[PDB]
Design a protein around this nucleic acid. Structure first.
Lengths: 164, 94, 141, 176, 38
RNA sequence: AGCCAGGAUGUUGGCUUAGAAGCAGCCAUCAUUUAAAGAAAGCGUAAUAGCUCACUGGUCGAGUCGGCCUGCGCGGAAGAU
């Protein structure tokens, strides 16, 4: 009986950390070990990221009652959840940051605005620029569209005149 | 604190007191002011678990007798010599 | 293969490592001489106060070569140095020694901030106060 | 207890039949076995067999728990068998096979003649290791135990027969 | 094997068992704790 | 209940100690991290270690845990025609 106020503290949190999060990552890990307890948890504090272990029996009532676009099947069994609440350009990277600092094969699913993004589709989203990178990518995108296409075309017609 | 339910004493004297305890009940009394004393009988194990609390003596409780509820405070207790089981208890009206 | 032990704990003073019983469980069982360790250790760990016992992890290989990595000195040794005491009380809470300021306790917390799991420097400052209790050191604002 | 009233699942290529107080079972490896148990009533449907106690045996479903556990080991007996490997370590005492008889060094002047009954088959890649197959867990476990009756691992160097595993970590001689 | 009494749980590995209808001590870590008397 | 996976950090706290460790002894028994961990109940390594327990998660699918009041059993219970 997890709905009892003494046990309800983790029951009420799923509404914020799984549905209410800006980014989330879900993994089948039964416990975190000293290495991730010491470094990966502490590295997340500077990234706007946090993470926790969650029980299956809770999730059978919580992710089935909460509306989710395909994401709730990844909350069956044990769960390590990792998540972020702010700065989209840093928050969306959590799937790659997990795959770099931890065993990438333990991830069940990854999510943005609390909804599932497949591991084959999240690649660009988990590579997204931060605010100071995005204004440089905008200047670069304006350059690529205006001059880049034409200098790439000049180099291509040059290379086509080397060939025989 | 508590609320408990009891009957009026059916039979009194040296054998009837032990016959009541063989029936898994024990005797008690209620007195106070200028009103007459009332003798009662009640069950052991549920009242023993309440009587073990400080709240049975540090504050008032209610008792039901003959289908009517009255307010009381505990005064005294008697026990068996080998184990602390309630032999008899005294109440005063509150 | 490494064949011998890896990342075994030791604590030792840089350029002052003469006695052999306090290093034998880490170095002597793995065939490493305390002088041969110290001529490496005191050159790669020259910047610290040599009089303090530095916590280090050591590793030895199948060819009797070795490597080592340091931690910052113990919070109780930093507290002893900051309070100016000869020793902790040895009967803590019931008996107490010295004094340290909260401004110095935060500098010990900053000295351990690279070597603890903590999320905030005031919270880690209460962790150093928890060590000050265990050595019987008086702490005041 | 909860399992004493639960079904035993019947594997692929296994066949089971019931006859009041008797279980009959067939397949591969052990190919055919049978047991009597008066203490239980038996039920069967396609891929499952179930037990429950008879009158005077009803206490804690204990004999139905025993019957569940027994037939759960018999389905493996008619599928692949038990006690798959046995070895020996020491100063030349040996563990090998010739026909159905164990080949070994004696220490004694006359042969100890440990041998395997019908329904058990064994082969050896070395004079220190034997691989074994059998129709049922008790009959192979009992003769594997008889081969270690006097040849069990000793308390100071651990030399002797091992069932591919051991419990003797050893100790040392008097007073240092 | 020892007699004594009270089937003493001399270590965590002392299981305490009923064998031949009598209470006994059995232990794999310390065979010295084999005892036949409650 | 079993089985399977995790079983933190300041920090080998202080004092002593051959030297000494969570675990040779005495004293503190705190704070942070944390799903979570006694400045460690028990095992255990030359010893720092390492492994269980404590503490957390899974697996699985109905009952289950310890004490209290109270009746009955067992062994404890060796002797001479």
């Amino acid at each position: 009986a997890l709905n009892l106020q003494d046990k309800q503290a983790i029951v009420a949190e799923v509404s914020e950390v799984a549905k209410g999060a800006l980014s989330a990552v879900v993994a089948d890990s039964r416990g975190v070990t000293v290495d991730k307890m010491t470094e990966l948890r502490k590295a997340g504090r500077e990234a706007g990221v946090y993470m926790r272990v969650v029980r299956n029996t809770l999730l059978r009532r919580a992710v089935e009652g909460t509306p989710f676009e395909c994401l709730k099947d990844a909350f069956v069994g044990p769960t390590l959840i990792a998540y972020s609440m702010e700065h989209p350009g840093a928050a969306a990277r959590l799937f790659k940051e997990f795959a770099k600092a931890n065993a990438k094969f333990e991830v069940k699913a990854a999510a943005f605005e609390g909804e599932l993004i497949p591991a084959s589709q999240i690649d660009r989203l988990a590579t997204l620029p931060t605010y100071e990178e995005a204004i440089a990518r905008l200047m670069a995108t304006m350059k690529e569209a205006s001059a880049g296409k034409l200098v790439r075309t000049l180099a291509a017609v040059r290379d086509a005149k080397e060939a025989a | 604190m508590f609320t408990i339910n009891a009957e009026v004493r059916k039979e009194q004297g040296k054998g009837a007191s032990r016959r009541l305890r063989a029936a898994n009940k024990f005797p008690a009394i209620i007195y106070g002011g200028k009103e007459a004393p009332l003798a009662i009988e009640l069950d052991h194990d549920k009242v023993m678990n309440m009587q073990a609390k400080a709240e049975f003596y540090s504050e008032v409780l209610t008792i039901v007798v003959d289908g009517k509820e009255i307010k009381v405070k505990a005064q005294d207790v008697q026990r068996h010599p080998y184990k602390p089981k309630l032999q008899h208890i005294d109440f005063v009206r509150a | 293969a490494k064949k011998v032990q890896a990342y075994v704990k030791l604590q030792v003073a840089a350029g002052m490592a003469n006695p052999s019983p306090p290093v034998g469980p880490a170095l002597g069982q793995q065939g490493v001489n305390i002088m041969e360790f110290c001529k490496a250790f005191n050159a790669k760990t020259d910047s610290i106060e040599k009089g303090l016992p530095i916590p280090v992890v050591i590793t030895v290989y199948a060819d009797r070569s070795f490597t080592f990595v340091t931690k910052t000195p113990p919070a109780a040794v930093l507290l002893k140095k900051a309070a100016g005491i000869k020793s902790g009380s040895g009967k803590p809470n019931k008996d107490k020694v010295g004094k340290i300021s909260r401004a110095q306790l935060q500098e010990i917390a900053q000295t351990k901030a690279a070597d603890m799991t903590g999320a905030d420097i005031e919270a880690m400052t209460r962790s150093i106060e928890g060590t000050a209790r265990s050595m019987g050191l008086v702490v005041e604002d | 207890s909860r399992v004493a009233k639960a079904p035993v699942v019947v594997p692929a290529g296994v066949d089971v039949k019931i006859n009041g107080q008797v279980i009959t079972i067939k397949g591969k490896n052990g190919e055919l076995t049978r047991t009597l148990n008066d203490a239980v009533e038996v039920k069967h449907a396609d891929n499952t067999l179930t037990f429950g106690p008879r009158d005077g045996y009803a206490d804690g479903w204990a004999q139905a728990g025993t019957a569940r556990a027994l037939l759960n080991s018999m389905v493996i007996g008619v599928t692949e068998g038990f006690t798959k490997k046995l070895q020996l370590v020491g100063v030349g005492y040996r563990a090998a096979v010739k026909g159905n008889v164990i080949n070994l060094s004696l220490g004694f002047s006359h042969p100890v003649d440990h041998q395997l009954p019908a329904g058990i088959t064994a082969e050896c890649p070395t004079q220190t290791e034997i691989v074994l197959k059998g129709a049922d867990k008790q009959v192979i476990g009992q003769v594997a135990a008889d081969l270690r009756a006097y040849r069990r691992p000793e308390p100071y160097k651990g030399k002797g027969v091992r069932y591919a595993d051991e419990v003797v970590r050893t100790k040392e001689a008097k007073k240092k | 094997m020892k007699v004594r009494a009270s089937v003493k749980k001399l270590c965590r590995n002392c299981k305490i068992v009923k064998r031949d209808g009598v209470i006994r001590v059995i232990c794999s870590a310390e065979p010295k704790h084999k005892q036949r008397q409650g």
